[PDB]
Amino acid sequence: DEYDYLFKVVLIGDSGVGKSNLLSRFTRNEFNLESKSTIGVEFATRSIQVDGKTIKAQIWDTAGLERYRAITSAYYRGAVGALLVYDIAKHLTYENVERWLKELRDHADSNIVIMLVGNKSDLRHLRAVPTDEARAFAEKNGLSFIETSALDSTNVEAAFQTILTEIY
Template sequence: MAKRMDIGESALTDEDSATMATAPYNYSYIFKYIIIGDMGVGKSCLLHQFTEKKFMADCPHTIGVEFGTRIIEVSGQKIKLQIWDTAGQERFRAVTRSYYRGAAGALMVYDITRRSTYNHLSSWLTDARNLTNPNTVIILIGNKADLEAQRDVTYEEAKQFAEENGLLFLEASAKTGENVEDAFLEAAKKIYQNIQDGSLDLNAAESGVQHKPSAPQGGRLTSEPQPQREGCGC
């Protein structure tokens, strides 16, 4: 479930990032994701569609960050995704930037019907490159692919931008669910590949990956925060 952390609540560090009560730990890795992009591009709707299999229309805009989790499978390995959805407003950038650190994957979202959100991608990419580790997997997502009649950014130009900057790319629709699964899974596959070929150091604190969580019975495991409020924002 996606959960909201409002701007008035303290921003969590990676150490705070986490803490989770024991439950069956039927997964081998935890990957930390962030979702970035302008306000209103549908970041929270993508998160909600991925974690809840539902589209939330008319969601309030995210204030601060929201958080969601889901277990997926890549190459026979169960992987838990910790997903941080950041507010797109400029006034929250200083706070949301603190969540970039230690991200294994970044989903950079624009709205295919609003060219301004595409034009701002270079700024978002600069933040992602500067604030994450060199092996962070960044995937570009053109959201609202269901609004083809209102398209303002072509698939071809976005694909070229992605290729020039070494990004994965696809278009998706948080409303219909088209390619939403693929967006999260493709990033996870690339991260897992980086683990397998040794280019991602699991011992590095900034890797954004934890391996084979374990905890004594009745104990606790460092992993994820537990914000108190719930909500969905775009």
């Protein structure tokens, strides 16, 4: 509805890390504590301002589990950014970041902007993934890095703003 650029940005990451609530927090300012596996593929949109011009962010979301049906290059097609999300309270979701990176190399453009997102920062007292460690990891792998909380809203706007500005 009037925009200068449409930037496709995808969300990826293990089931349960907060992808769907990052989407809902960013596009509708809504959060649900309930947990429910995402159905098929969804996308939602939000427009923001960058360098005086209007950026329509089209943000895709899908299930992190790829057992019976796996994500294809069509999911990633034309994506200029990826929010690769893990749960700072569940170490396994961070261990699996390498698998997501492999999936991005196989299925996404070699120059996509990748933001590593440590979500659930409000669970800092349950932290399983030290901030400094993830930050260095992002550094070595050519990713941006931010910790967010969809629940209390911390850094959610900043994460999307930053990636869309990096892309711009």
